[PDB]
Amino acid sequence: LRSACDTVDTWLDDTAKGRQNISPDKIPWSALKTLMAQSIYGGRVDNEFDQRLLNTFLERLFTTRSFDSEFKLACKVDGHKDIQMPDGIRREEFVQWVELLPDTQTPSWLGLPNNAERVLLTTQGVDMISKMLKMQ
């Protein structure tokens, strides 16, 4: 995360040389995507399908369309609703959106099917019973 933040800071300063506002089309999306796919986050990836999965998130989130008012961070999270992109322009506006999250997270937020957690949630629930019985 720190390396990615430095990469964002370095390349945005190169393009926005003191400009108060930078057009979304002028933001170096390719520089951010390629460095994260190859150097920052893709360095640990040793699989061609994990790299394919790592890219898929990059050309979706890191685009000029992410500055639109109708961008979808996640799709069909509950089959009906989808997570929307905040319309704010300041840090506090984005943070308040995080604090207002539904708190009903499902693996569909991550792009995975919701059934992926069914076995994991069952095992953890059974483990709780064993832990409660062990220390009774």
The answer to whether 82 and 74 are in contact (CB under 8 A) is yes
Q: Which long-range contacts (CB under 8 A, 24 or more apart) does 93-97 make?
A: none
The answer to whether 99 and 86 are in contact (CB under 8 A) is no
The answer to whether 5 and 41 are in contact (CB under 8 A) is no
Instruction: Please give the Cα distance from 54 to 39 (Å, whole number).
Output: 12
The answer to whether 70 and 76 are in contact (CB under 8 A) is no
The answer to whether 35 and 7 are in contact (CB under 8 A) is yes
Q: How far is CA 8 from CA 29, 30, 35, 76, 119, in A?
A: 10, 11, 10, 29, 38
User: Resolution in angstroms, to 1 decimal, for this deposition?
Assistant: 2.8
> What pairs with residue 72 in β-bridges?
84
Instruction: Please give the Cα distance from 65 to 25 (Å, whole number).
Output: 9
The answer to whether 67 and 24 are in contact (CB under 8 A) is yes
Instruction: Please give the Cα distance from 62 to 109 (Å, whole number).
Output: 17
The answer to whether 74 and 109 are in contact (CB under 8 A) is yes
Q: How far is CA 116 from CA 30, 108, 121, 122, 127, in A?
A: 32, 9, 9, 11, 18
- Tokens 């460095």 found at: 35
